C-alpha cells in the first residue's frame, strides 16, 4: 500500500480492512490521504451531532425556537428549520463560522494529523504498550465506525423526510 499505511488499521468492517472498492486512495499521496481522513472525521463528527440534534428535535424538545417563536415548532426537523426565526439561523451560521475560523487559522491542527482539532498529539502517547491504556486505536475505530454510520443515517433521515415524510 505504502501511503495508505498512514490510515491503516482504522477502517473496514474489521479494523484492519482497507475497503476502498473504488481505488479512491491508490496513486494518491500521503498528505492527500491524510486530508481525505480529515474530511471523513469532520463529516462524521458533525453527522453524530446531527443525528443527536435530529432526535432531540423530532421528539418535541426545541426550547430555543419554541421560546423564540412563541409557539411550539413542528416536530419534523426539516419543517422546524423554516419556522425557526431568521435571526436564529444567521447566528447559528456565524457561530460555526467562528469555530471553523478558530480551528483553521489561529489554532491550526498539525499537518501530520489534520484531524487533531483539540490537539491531543502534544500530550498523547499513542505508541506505548500498556493494556489499561494505549487502546487509543480502538477508540479511533469507535469514532470512525460510529461516525460513518451516522453519515448514512442522517442522509436517510433527510432523504426520507424530504420524500416519504
Amino acid at each position: 500500500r505504502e501511503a495508505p499505511k498512514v490510515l491503516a488499521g482504522t477502517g473496514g468492517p474489521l479494523p484492519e480492512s482497507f475497503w476502498d472498492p473504488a481505488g479512491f486512495t491508490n496513486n494518491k499521496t500521503d498528505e492527500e490521504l491524510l486530508f481525505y481522513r480529515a474530511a471523513e472525521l469532520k463529516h462524521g463528527r458533525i453527522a453524530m451531532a446531527a443525528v443527536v440534534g435530529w432526535f432531540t428535535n423530532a421528539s418535541g424538545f426545541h426550547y430555543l425556537g419554541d421560546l423564540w417563536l412563541k409557539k411550539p415548532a413542528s416536530d419534523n426537523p426539516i419543517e422546524a428549520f423554516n419556522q425557526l426565526s431568521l435571526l436564529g439561523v444567521f447566528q447559528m451560521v456565524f457561530f460555526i463560522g467562528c469555530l471553523e475560523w478558530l480551528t483553521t487559522v489561529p489554532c491550526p491542527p498539525p499537518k501530520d494529523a489534520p484531524w487533531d482539532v483539540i490537539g491531543m498529539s502534544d500530550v498523547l502517547e499513542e505508541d506505548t504498550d500498556e493494556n489499561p491504556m494505549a487502546e487509543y486505536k480502538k477508540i479511533q475505530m469507535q469514532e470512525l465506525n460510529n461516525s460513518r454510520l451516522a453519515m448514512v443515517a442522517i442522509i436517510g433521515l433527510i432523504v426520507q423526510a424530504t420524500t416519504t415524510g
Binding site: 489561529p106 483539540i118 502517547e125 500498556e130
Partner: protein, 250 residues
Amino acid sequence: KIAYLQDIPRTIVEKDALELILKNTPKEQWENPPEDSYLYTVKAFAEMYGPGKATKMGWWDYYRLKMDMPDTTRLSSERELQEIEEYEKLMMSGKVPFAVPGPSGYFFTGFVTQWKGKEPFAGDQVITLTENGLFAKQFLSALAFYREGLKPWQRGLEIGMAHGYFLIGPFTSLGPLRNTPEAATVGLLCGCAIVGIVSIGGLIFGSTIKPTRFDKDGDKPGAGFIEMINWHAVGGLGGAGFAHALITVF
C-alpha cells in the same frame, strides 16, 4: 522446591486453585507465607494433613478449612494480574490512563496522556489537555493579552471593545429602567461606568504591582501595562457605544 507445596492432597485444596494462589501470591512469600494470606493457611494445614501425616479430619474441622481456602473464584486471573502490573507501571512512569468524570464515576478514554511535565517535581507543569494541548496552547497564545506582534494599545483596544460590548447587555436588560422608553442609554451609561471602574482598578494595579512584561526596552517600568489599561478604557467606551448604536438602530 518448597516442602509443603508438594504432594498436597486435592481434598485440602485443588490443583488449579493452588496454582492460582501461587501465581497471585508474590514469589518471595512462598517459603514463609506471611499471616492472613491464603497461602499461610495452606502451609499451616498441608504440614499437618497429607500422605505421611494425619489423613483424616473431623467433619467440622474440614468444613471450617473449606471456608478458609479460596473458592477458585476470588483470585485474580493472569490477565487481571497483567492489568494491575501494567496499570501500576503506567502510574509510576508518570503517565496516566486518561479518564473523564461522569455520572458519579469516570469513563476511561483509552488514552495515555503523559502526566508529569518537563519539570517533574513542579506542581503546575503537570500537562493536561485543557491547558497543554495544541488547541489550548494556541488559543491562549493568540489571546489579545498574549498575541505576538501586538502593540500594547492594540491589546488594550481589543480587550476593551470586547468588555464594553458585552457589559451593556446586563444593564439595558433586567435593569432598574429595563422597561422605560430609553432602557438602553441607561445601560450604556452603566456599562461605561463598569469599564471605567475596572480601568481604574487596572491603573491601581499598574501603579502598585507595575508589571513589566509589556514595557519596551529602556522605558518607565509599567508603562506598557498603563498604556494597555488606558486603551482598554477607550475600547470599552467604543464597544459600549457600538452595542448601544446597534440596539437603537436595529
